[PDB]
Design a binder for this molecule. Structure first.
Ligand SMILES: *[C@@]12=NC3=[C]C([C])=C([C])[C]=C3N([C][C]([O])[C]([O])[C]([O])[C]OP([O])([O])=O)C1=NC(=O)[N]C2=O
Length: 104
């Protein structure tokens, strides 16, 4: 599936891993995404009430499933059924955030 892995222990919670289907779906190149916060997929038509939720889940560090509007590198807009999950891989502490993306 399309998914990425982010490391919240780094400044701005950057994408450190992105599956191939993800790069296919967004039309970007691995060199472009890696190191960057995912928000670069949002645009003028993206609902901010949705982006607010995502922001909450992240800070509060919980799971969430939000439908958000994104734009490929080319400029084409698409619906993104986004699901968030926490890699509590630790012993309480959050180590990674896993995100699954689906063009819907
Ligand atoms: C992005 N996918 C994505 C994947 C993971 C694993 C995480 C943690 C977040 C995302 N986002 C959200 C984005 O990075 C950010 O959390 C929000 O924009 C809110 O924070 P800011 O600081 O910007 O207010 C994703 N956002 C997208 O729009 N598309 C994805 O595919």
């Amino acid at each position: 599936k399309s998914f990425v892995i982010t490391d919240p222990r780094l400044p701005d919670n950057p994408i450190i891993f992105a599956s191939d289907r993800f790069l296919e779906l967004t039309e970007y190149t691995r060199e472009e995404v890696l190191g960057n916060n995912c928000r670069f997929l949002q645009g003028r038509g993206t609902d901010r009430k949705a982006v607010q939720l995502i922001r909450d889940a992240v800070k509060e560090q919980r799971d969430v499933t939000v439908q958000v509007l994104n734009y490929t590198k080319g400029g084409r807009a698409f619906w993104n059924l986004f699901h968030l999950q926490v890699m509590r891989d630790e012993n309480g502490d959050v180590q990674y955030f896993i995100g699954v993306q689906q063009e819907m």
